[PDB]
């Protein structure tokens with residue numbers, strides 16, 4: 001409770017300047033200390049579900065040897081706006097592992113939908129999240145409909161706390177077997193879409209893996225990350241935003257600033 005109180009007022013001022021709501025949960029995996037701000041409210045996942053999607057693929061690969069190297073062929077009708085990798089392999093197909101890397105590191109929408117199909121759709125990803133003990137996460141729709149970010153709509157949402165707890169289980173805990181855990185971490189470390197979010201708050205000498213989400217409406221965007229500061233245990237954190245009006249713009253700078261405050265509250269000099 002103490003650390004959450006240290007940064008309560010700065011968080012309130014930051015979201016007031018932003019003009020919306022900011023939700024943050026950050027966990028120091030060494031001491032167990034946490035920082036919360038609106039950490040139990042639901043926020044739209046936007047593309048951030050794609051990280052958990054890749055983890056679910058990795059979990060299935062523990063039971064289905066050769067899943068990762070399976071080729072997937074698809075037609076032009078599988079392409080979705082913002083499919084930067086999968087459009088370049090339309091005429092050849094891609095493997096499940098390549099689709100997973102594209103979904104994580106480029107937020108590729110066609111790749112995400114193809115992998116959702118393999119796992120049984122939104123309910124199948126939700127079922128995987130239930131299997132690791134996450135009772136908050138829900139995915140309901142596909143790309144791009146899941147980005148609607150309608151105020152008060154619980155579809156395609158989770159909470160910053162549940163996102164962080166599930167991220168910890170998959171990247172540092174025992175939810176995945178050791179080889180799959182490191183592959184998930186490696187995919188997150190190679191993300192290309194988050195340079196202006198949590199990574200902007202993290203010194204250059206720290207390792208970081210993250211997954212972004214941007215809904216394109218309602219000031220709604222997010223990022224979650226595992227951060228390895230030098231000389232101490234890793235930090236896991238999630239920063240989610242939303243705003244009341246459809247035309248409100250998200251802010252990457254606000255996400256970076258919220259990450260800075262969370263790390264400061266935890267006592268992580270950065």
Ligand SMILES: Cc1cc2oc(=O)cc(CP(=O)(O)O)c2cc1C
Pocket residue numbers: 056057059060119124125127128131
């Ligand atoms: C995609 C997926 C969905 C799942 O939904 C479940 O209800 C239970 C599990 C764990 P399992 O029973 O297979 O050990 C589960 C796993 C994956 C990858």
Ligand SMILES: Cc1cc2oc(=O)cc(CP(=O)(O)O)c2cc1C
Pocket residue numbers: 046047048082106107109144147193212213214215216
């Ligand atoms: C609708 C939409 C807007 C986006 O605007 C961005 O600025 C960044 C991305 C990639 P994301 O941050 O979601 O990983 C993005 C994705 C979608 C579907």
